[PDB]
Design a protein around this ligand. Structure first.
Ligand SMILES: *C(=O)CCCC[C@@H]1SC[C@@H]2NC(=O)N[C@@H]21
Ligand SMILES: *C(=O)CCCC[C@@H]1SC[C@@H]2NC(=O)N[C@@H]21
Ligand SMILES: *C(=O)CCCC[C@@H]1SC[C@@H]2NC(=O)N[C@@H]21
Lengths: 507, 182, 359, 507, 91
């Protein structure tokens, strides 16, 4: 056998992976293989695979046998482009040793992370594993340590996107916790530290795989996964479109893309969304959809902390992040869960120079022992900090209510905001007229007259505007045009801040 | 200026276009303002300005003047087009996506739109219905008011009421059944 | 705005000595440490009158926002003191640990405790029996200068210990596991307290000493549904980001991913010592042998062979995971030496607009 | 056997090394072992050994046998102090596998280099090896690559000192080429790439071990080794004293040490060293010894390029570097070899903030085809650059001759010097009076009168001094005091220079 | 200020001092200006100011006034001392 023949056989084996019968199982299971997934993700013909001939060096427990020598060692790594833009990817291959992490496995992933940091290119990981490769022992633990170090170092330098498309257990579960966004695939992906076998052995509780770490749990109740997609093909199609929003590095401005939607059009549909009756809820999403370019909005965590809306959109071609209240759910009140989702989204957009638009309608905080015992004070400070720290353009629109300390938490002008607009129905106060009059006028005669006088003077947007809290009071139909104008002039804005070794968010 | 973008040199677009129950083979190419499209062997030339933001898109197909509206678009290939007044649902995948999509499990889910449950704990203050009442989609059925805020519970299905399970004055929790539709 | 701007520039200490309601409750959430006064201080957003009006639950003032609740169950207050006079006396002594600004080195104060003395009391604290717990605090007290240790949140997340002490006059921060509680396992609550403490000490140039003895993570749906994955990443990040000296001592167990979370050498640590009872592995010998040797004859022989080779500190040390294996009696002197030479250590890191911790 | 018993046996084996019989051979051979050498080098009780229990992981060719498992894997690594000052060391142990380099061998060395860079501590290596461990194959080549990368990265950050105390072959020979100083041991150390067996096989020439790579060759003819010492004990004793001159890092100022030698004393012995007769040579070393503190001078390469003197000394407690001409050899003329030694010494002292004192007495360059064909132009530019680039204090004293382009090469004031003094016998000119008059006055009558007129006006130190080339003309007896004064005021001097990615020395 | 220097805590100096053909055992300790030196069991106290730069070093050895000159010193232990006019080579 010649050298060239050996090489050709090594290429064909790396392409097959764990063997055709294991591929057949993956397809029976409704899953794509690691190499098929890359072909869908990246532009045709743009993918360049690295280190395809790397094999493990473990010789213990029979691992020195030729029957265990799978070139590629369970990961596909390399670089490519999505719509002409450079991206680094890796995808874990479940057909070779179960997708378990070896020393060399982690290495290959680390090397492309080092290039991505060096050139300033994003990294997308497609995760699917069973955990560490116990046959190597502590080399897989060193593998995890090296990946974790890169994931932390890359934070704020390049965006890191993780899509989980299968099981995930052991140390693998912490890389999505270090990246910026985590997505899952409904009823196909799992994310858990230990399996149901350990849970039942430790505590006398019964649980199945879908209940312990299923995609529905992590998108609806734990707040870990940002969005689950129906299947592998739809998940990668939406991932490509999501990719188009983000810059390649934090040194880059928010991407600007060709846009046909005139920036100066009016939106008459906004003038009557907000009811005059204070106890009538409305859907904030109707406002978000009508303002954003071509009515396209990418919603993050649609099923978790529904009282606050966060997501991506484009206005006049430029990527922006949108945060707003949802009065339809829990009167639009802040709670622990909403503060966690908000702070994380805001922090990402600030780090990568993506402007923020805030739609405020918040009557206060959710009362009760469930929130007080949960540390609502500690968690609420997370959203206040996330806005106060921001140095990217911030445009706030107040649609109806902003009572109490929630006014400042939801990116008020006094946290170094750029512009703040009020709609005619906006009301800014420490509390509603009923509470304020009962406290201010206590024991006096003709309280009912005092109630009428207070409402006429303070139950509107004027006592705040005349003080400099609001820059203008605008007709809702003009909101989009007003925001577009601010975005196109604040984009070159820089501010100074004292030197710090690093930030100290309340956590 | 730091990261030059290179436009993919795509000569032909090979698409698998699913309509009602047939999958058609369509190959398109761009020559500026006109797309040369072969639909199962038939040659068509679609010329337009392709302003993608306007609600009304005017196209000329082999000299024939058409107006279409794109009502929705999804990354998964779904596109809703109103053509001659009727909305057609077309799913456009690339050749590669269509060939791999055959490996996806055809899972069947349940349409749970007739069972109307309380989305939020609180007291029921109004019920607009009794058994036998007609219900339209989006119709208000019950009004629950907690935390100084009237929350309307609407129907997700056109039908009639079979039973009203919670009345005005009752206190309900999260997930409790309010009204059952046919 | 000032409380956020000052973060990482000057330390901000808040002591609550009475009621606190409304917007006032968020300033302690922006400062670095929050202390309370037992049965005198309260911290709540709305009073019991609002809670009863919104939801049909009964609660009193001490239950809704009392000092005992915030130091034991919510994890908001770092420590409650008996009364106003004792609270300020302990606050003065706490003050003496901290630098005035992040531009300053950790304070160094006159110390009479010889830096090179041996501590024979350490050699027999850790039992040879793997299912016998011990009190980590006995180790912490015997190492630190003059046996003075300032414990933070003594009644919250008892499975992890964090606090301040001085070694050879220099202020250091100490983090360690407590095997006495929940076998020394990590959970959501322990990760939250750890990450916050570590982050403060790093920002103000206070060295870290870590005492590791962690068998893994607390299993169960209570932790999985609570986002144990998300919260565990907080402690891993807090150590990985640190640029101040980090000295780790492994006393007995370090299994699984918890090895790296508890400030392993592979997160840019400076020194890492093992005691003779240390064992570093992906999992214990029983699980590993049942998985490695599946369906083979004479498994019992394979079990003996595996334990003899891997159930010790050697497969990690021979790979460069551990710098030395030391007699416990010498631990204090070894740490003192490292602190007095790593104090001038600087590292470079790529430019970032700001950090992005998983939250 | 208990765990504690196993540990104790592992400690005793690591201390023994390759076995008592191999130690006996080392002592018969007049060599110390690697551990005995460290005890001599470092302060008593200050040494802390790292990674004493590390073993190789190679399982091929019988390397998995227990008989080959030597803890420590042929190197002693760790840290300590010399006179209270932190230093990192390693010493190669010849008794285990011949001192050959394994993967793990290089690792252990790399780890202490990484600490030394992190804290800012010097590294001293004691080298003795036979080359790569061929049983591992390419892992030892990766070992060399990692060491080489650290040795380059540390340059200009911490000083790196290498003492060769035995044979050295293969890739090992390049680490002393990357460190700052290389020392050897006479008739015990060797430094060669290939042995005499390869040389005789390739070319028809006979050579023995001492001729091919002996210490005498490298200190006298190739210019590779800076100094050879008689034996192992004397080599380490002089190494400790050498260590005391250098800073721990380039961020530190030149060390200052208690000194009893008054800084303001006169040195009458200098006034009559330089003869009035231009063709009478004198020994520059008499001047160097009389100026430096307590007449202690550390001479570098005493037997190579004898026409230029470089070395270390202390003036008023502060470490300084001294460069000067030696008129006793080749009239004090510059050649290829002298330029190479000078540029390297000057470059080190500049990088680590050690002031320079220059004693100039140079009539020009060595003429002839031997120098022209050797690239005298290219090599002479090395010394000119090394001085011109310097940003540390430079004090020059001109004792007698400085003709031609050599004036500027030997650190003239026009290369951003700080002070430049002339003795009464100094003469600065393009060329001597005889050549200049024959060229200037060509074909004229009464040339002899023109010769007398030229000598009276130009054959002295005045035409340069009156132009600003010389700051003062001083009596030699005051030289030491004048230099001490300049050193104590230039020590805080900083200069600005344009940004550069890196220097581009002519090479 | 970056790298604190720690003075070795040396209680006793145990030296092997070679003269002409004999090797002597000498143990010295410092108590400030006076060195307490035991030379093969004999106790001597050497007091001086120990100015190491002067060509003339004045010492007092058990009350006996001596002047010595250090003519050379090497790292290898060689030291040339002129004592009563005669130069002795001690290692
Ligand atoms: C009735 O008195 C309940 C009042 C609750 C109104 C809302 S709920 C959350 C905010 N907190 C508060 O005190 N008022 C707001
Ligand atoms: C019995 O089989 C229960 C085993 C639990 C042991 C501990 S508890 C937490 C760690 N996780 C794990 O799987 N083992 C460790
Ligand atoms: C006799 O004419 C030989 C003259 C050499 C004098 C010296 S040697 C090197 C210098 N170069 C030169 O031209 N003169 C100097």
């Amino acid at each position: 056998t010649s050298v060239n023949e050996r090489i050709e056989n090594k290429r064909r084996t790396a392409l097959l992976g764990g063997g055709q019968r294991r591929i057949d199982a993956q397809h029976k299971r409704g899953k794509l293989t690691a190499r098929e997934r890359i072909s869908l993700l990246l532009d045709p013909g743009s993918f360049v695979e690295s280190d395809m001939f790397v094999e493990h060096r473990c010789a213990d427990f029979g691992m020195a046998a030729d029957k265990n020598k799978f070139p590629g060692d369970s990961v596909v790594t390399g670089r490519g482009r999505i719509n002409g833009r450079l991206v680094y990817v890796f995808s874990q291959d479940f057909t070779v040793f179960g997708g378990s992490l070896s020393g060399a496995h982690a290495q290959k992933i680390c090397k492309i992370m080092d290039q991505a940091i060096t050139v300033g290119a994003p990294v997308i990981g497609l995760n699917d594993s069973g955990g560490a490769r116990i046959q190597e022992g502590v080399e897989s633990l060193a593998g995890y340590a090296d990946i974790f170090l890169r994931n932390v170092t890359a934070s704020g330098v390049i965006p890191q996107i993780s899509l989980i498309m299968g099981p995930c257990a052991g140390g693998a579960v912490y890389s999505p916790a270090l990246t910026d966004f985590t997505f899952m695939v409904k009823d196909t992906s799992y994310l858990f530290i230990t399996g149901p076998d350990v849970v039942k052995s430790v505590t006398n509780e019964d649980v199945t795989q879908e209940e312990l770490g299923g995609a529905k749990t992590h998108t609806t109740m734990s707040g870990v996964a940002h969005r689950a997609f129906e299947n592998d093909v739809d998940a990668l199609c939406n991932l490509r479109d999501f990719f188009n929003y983000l810059p390649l590095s934090s040194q880059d401005p928010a991407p600007v893309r060709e846009c046909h939607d005139p920036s100066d059009r009016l939106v008459p549909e906004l003038d009557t969304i907000v009811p005059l009756e204070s106890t009538k809820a409305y859907n904030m999403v109707d406002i978000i959809h009508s303002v954003v370019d071509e009515r396209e909005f990418f919603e993050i965590m649609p099923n978790y902390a529904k009282n606050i809306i966060v997501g991506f959109a484009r206005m006049n071609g430029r990527t922006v992040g949108i945060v707003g209240n949802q009065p339809k759910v829990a009167s639009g009140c802040l709670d622990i869960n909403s503060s966690v989702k908000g702070a994380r989204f805001v922090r990402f957009c600030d780090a990568f120079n993506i402007p923020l638009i805030t739609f405020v309608d918040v009557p206060g905080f959710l009362p009760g022992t469930a929130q007080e015992y949960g540390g609502i004070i500690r968690h609420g400070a997370k959203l206040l900090y996330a806005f106060a720290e921001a140095t990217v353009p911030k445009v706030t629109v107040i649609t109806r209510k902003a009572y109490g300390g929630a006014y400042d938490v939801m990116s008020s002008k006094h946290l170094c905001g750029d512009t703040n607009y009020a709609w005619p129905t906006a009301e800014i106060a420490v509390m509603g007229a009923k509470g304020a009059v009962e406290i201010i006028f206590k024991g006096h005669e003709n309280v009912e007259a005092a109630q009428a006088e207070y409402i006429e003077k303070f139950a509107n947007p004027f006592p705040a505007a005349v003080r400099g809290f609001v820059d203008d009071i605008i007709q809702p139909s003009s909101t989009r045009a007003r925001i577009c104008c601010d975005l196109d002039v604040l984009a070159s804005k820089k501010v100074q801040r004292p030197w710090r070794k690093h930030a100290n968010i309340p956590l | 200026s730091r990261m030059p973008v290179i436009k993919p040199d795509i000569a032909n677009w090979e698409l698998s276009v699913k309509l009602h129950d047939k999958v058609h083979t369509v190959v398109a190419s761009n020559n500026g303002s006109v797309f040369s499209v072969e639909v199962d062997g038939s040659k068509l030339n679609v010329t337009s300005t392709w302003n993608l933001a306007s609600p009304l898109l005017s196209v000329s197909v082999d000299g024939t003047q058409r107006t279409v509206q794109c009502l929705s678009r999804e990354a998964g290939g779904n596109m809703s087009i109103q053509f001659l007044g009727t909305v057609y649902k077309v799913n456009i995948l690339t050749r590669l996506a269509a060939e791999l999509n055959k490996f996806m499990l055809e899972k069947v889910t349940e349409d749970t739109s007739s069972v109307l449950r309380s989305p939020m704990p609180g007291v029921v203050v109004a019920v607009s219905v009794k058994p036998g009442d007609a219900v339209a989609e989006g119709q208000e059925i019950c009004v629950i008011e907690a935390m100084k805020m009237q929350n309307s519970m609407t129907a997700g299905k056109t039908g009639t009421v079979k039973s009203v399970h919670c009345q005005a004055g009752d206190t309900v929790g999260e997930g409790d059944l309010l009204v059952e539709l046919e």
